[PDB]
Design a protein that fits this description.
The structure is cut from a larger assembly and holds chains A (396 residues), B (128 residues) and C (202 residues). Chain A has 396 residues and is α+β, with helices and mostly antiparallel strands. Chain A contains eight helices and 15 strands. The termini of chain A are far apart. With 128 residues, chain B is mainly beta. The longest helix of chain B is centred in the C-terminal third of the chain and has 4 residues. Classes of the chains: A alpha+beta (396), B mainly beta (128), C mainly alpha (202). Bound molecules: magnesium ion (7 copies). The structure holds four RNA strands. Chain B: Belongs to the universal ribosomal protein uL14 family.
Chain lengths: 396, 128, 202
Amino acid sequence: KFEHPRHGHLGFLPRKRSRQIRGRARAFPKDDATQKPHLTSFMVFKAGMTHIVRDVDRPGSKVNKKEVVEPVTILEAPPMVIVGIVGYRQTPVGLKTIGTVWAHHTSVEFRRRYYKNWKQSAQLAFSRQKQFANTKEGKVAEARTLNAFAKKASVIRVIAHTQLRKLRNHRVGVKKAHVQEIQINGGNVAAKIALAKSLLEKEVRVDSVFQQSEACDVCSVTKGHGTEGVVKRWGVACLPRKTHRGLRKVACIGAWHPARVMYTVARAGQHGYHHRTQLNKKIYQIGRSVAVEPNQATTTYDLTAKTITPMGGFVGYGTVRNDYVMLKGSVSGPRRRVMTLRRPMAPQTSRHLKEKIVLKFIDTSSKIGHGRFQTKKEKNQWFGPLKKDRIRREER
Amino acid sequence: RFRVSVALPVGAVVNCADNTGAKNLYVISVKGYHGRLNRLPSAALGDMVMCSVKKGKPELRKKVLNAVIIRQRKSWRRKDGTVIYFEDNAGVIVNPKGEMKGSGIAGPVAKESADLWPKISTHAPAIV
Amino acid sequence: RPEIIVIDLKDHVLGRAAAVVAKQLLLGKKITVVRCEQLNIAGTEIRNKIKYLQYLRKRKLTNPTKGPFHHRAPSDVFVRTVRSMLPRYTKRGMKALNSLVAYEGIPPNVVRTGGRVVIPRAQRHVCYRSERPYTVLGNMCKHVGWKYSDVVANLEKARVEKASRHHEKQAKLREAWKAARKEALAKMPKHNVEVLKKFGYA
RNA sequence: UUAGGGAUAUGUGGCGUCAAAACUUAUGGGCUCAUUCGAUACGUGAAAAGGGUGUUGGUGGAUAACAAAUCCACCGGCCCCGAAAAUGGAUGACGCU
RNA sequence: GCGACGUCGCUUUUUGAUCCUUCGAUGUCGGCUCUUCCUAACCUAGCGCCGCAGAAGACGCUAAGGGUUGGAUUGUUCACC
RNA sequence: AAAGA
RNA sequence: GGUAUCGUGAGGGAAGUAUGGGGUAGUAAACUCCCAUGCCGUGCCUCUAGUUUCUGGGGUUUGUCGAACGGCAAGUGCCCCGAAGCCAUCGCACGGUGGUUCUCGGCUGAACUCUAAGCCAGAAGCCAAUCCCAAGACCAGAUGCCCAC
Ligand SMILES: [Mg+2]
Ligand SMILES: [Mg+2]
Ligand SMILES: [Mg+2]
Ligand SMILES: [Mg+2]
Ligand SMILES: [Mg+2]
Ligand SMILES: [Mg+2]
Ligand SMILES: [Mg+2]
């Protein structure tokens, strides 16, 4: 008889706190040995959002026509320092690591990750591996396992961490290094270590991994809300105003049989702070740093000079100082939470996902307000030498 | 069709911006709506609805008839990124197939209702 | 220190073999099982796929992560057929179960653990072969899950050939005996050649 | 059909594992493949006609030609469909062919 | 596509029985809310087939996977628009 | 797991 | 042994689904696609909207501090506006994958036709996979660091 479509999605149970804030790709793309060895993932930090105006393509009705305002997300992406190389056997109980070569140097932020205090400690992390690397048996026991990553290995995963001393953001209160294994999806695993062995202990910047107009998948950890009730966690319904013992509940959570509450009925508990993936988030610009190009947000039709950082920074994040990546739309983070990009799974051959992009406008109007001004040198033009600077720029 | 925000649930009294005699357009049900549970059928800016006139001439009153929304007092975000809306709800009263039926509209018909009804725009003083 | 009777299960019917292994585990012996892939079952594959998709259909309605946990990977389907042929809710029967290992193929730690063993009273071919449809268990479990059929079909290929590298190398070490043991006659006391001949060991 | 014990032997029921017993009998005669086979009485009854161009059995009646053998009609099932429900699911379980 | 005549299997949200459980209490229909399940398939989905030229219907099978509304009167279930 | 065998 | 990091992933969960359009084409009608919308799902807060105990800034009302200034009392006086945060099918982003088989069109022909053996083929379907959880599946996964006795 009467019914409705079921509330919430059973394929995101249990609604549980993710085991770490670090967004972590559960699966990397299928290894097409017909490609070149490359890096298929990258960790960025969610700065915040803004929106942009685009010259549209893909002839439809709202397309092949005047521009469009589409909301975007700014993800600050400093270059990642590769430290290790990790290979896996394809054994009948699923992949298993067959060793891990490290670099000879290992940044002081990486070694913090193997601690939880690091300032009362004695900093012995990787002490007998720096020493033993300078040995000869070290070089033996290192090429003995690199000559293994070709015999036994199929999956080769460098270990990259983030540069945070290169991320002058303070509101990212952490000084450890976020450590992430990254798949290499080239071919001829012999030539797959060759990449890994090469870029080891070298910085990997995000445009080396990704290109501008193509889409990624964003492994991330949702913004947490603590214990949310049934109406907020599952979005079931509110009982009528007349209800006793209140109305933000599921009335019937079980028949007489089965005489147990089902895993399908809605209950209150952890909402948010879940690991999500957000397939097919399309990059619109992968612009470089202000230290190298202090004209981030001025493409061709905003011949003024400006940067991505809005007037007064991104709210609750700061200024973007590094190789930001501009996606399209939502990303399952709060500000300054590490996001992991990933090259996508989908066939991606479409006139709605493989089309190239030019951005005719970006908004740097302040997040903190309403903002009516781009590029604060426009605000000074609206006003005059008002009494704040008048009491300083006329008192000399 | 468009991504117009919905403004006029079933049972809304829209007024008639069409010189056919009527004054109100008590929304009977939205033509084209696919039912959902406990969800009131909500008209939008371009939607064609079925109406009964609650005020105006009697030659069209006690009768179910059609209507196309002209104006929407609820702000819908245009896809060009411009959130726009009207002083007042408004709807032409229309042929069951869809045709103008009534003296050219006394109001600024919106873009989302003209390019879904080639017979309305040709009677509307302004388009906005 | 221990003594394991490393059994083999190529062309052993899944049930005439789990009944024999169960009773031996239950007689205190410590059986390790290999090549559960090649276990056979009577009937066509479709019939055996439905006799198992009807079991993959049973789960605790209210909480599946408590329901009957179905296993792909014949290595434990053979363990599953044994656990069911066994007194599970005694410590006697949980010890008997924990004496199997039931690998897949011949892992490297049991290729060099001595010669291995088969159960003739379960080999599907005590007689002529008529035409009847049997199903390799590794080929029925590929079709209900068990992503790792490719994996073990290559691990066991890099072995059935790497062993064949060692049957023909060290082949010229074998006849260094069956000839030395052959000409180990007619130089030695006829005193003993006669009783080797008597009891056939000649 | 019943005092407390031991032994010998049976009853009903059984002897692949659970489970003692054919460590899967040197078993013998046929039957059976069943995309829910079938398998301990009484549990309640499992499946009713119906047919076939199906697998095995039997009787009436031709040709010496079917498209050196090949027929016209039926009796008999094992077995195919006829036949279906609602927590997941039961020969008791696995499993057996 | 069914209809004479008819019959024969299986049917419960069935009409009643039965008095087996409950009389030192299994709290009464309907809703609300929410979850599940089945197919005897309403929709979409797959061919099939006709006096199925297009159109458009027509019969049928396979599939429980997804979907199956908003109101007026009624306490209603049902019924009706 | 080794590697030798 | 401890502690720490990175993984593995057995197993369980599982979801995307409708509708219109353009298109070639009034064609001995649909079909890779192109285009939206709707629902569902998961997110998000750039915008729009709501929200205000930033009681932020202002205004005002009775009382009240001798009066302004400044406040205060009216369990937040009332009011206009209001960032931040939260949040809306009120805003926004995203959710188009490989095998396997049966219906089935059919192949070879035996004892001429699809099947008695030999066989392609494919909609759902199931099955993994993407996805969510994660060794009480006790990981002889890899790895960092280290004692006393
Ligand atoms: Mg009350
Ligand atoms: Mg005795
Ligand atoms: Mg016999
Ligand atoms: Mg009730
Ligand atoms: Mg009502
Ligand atoms: Mg898994
Ligand atoms: Mg699984």
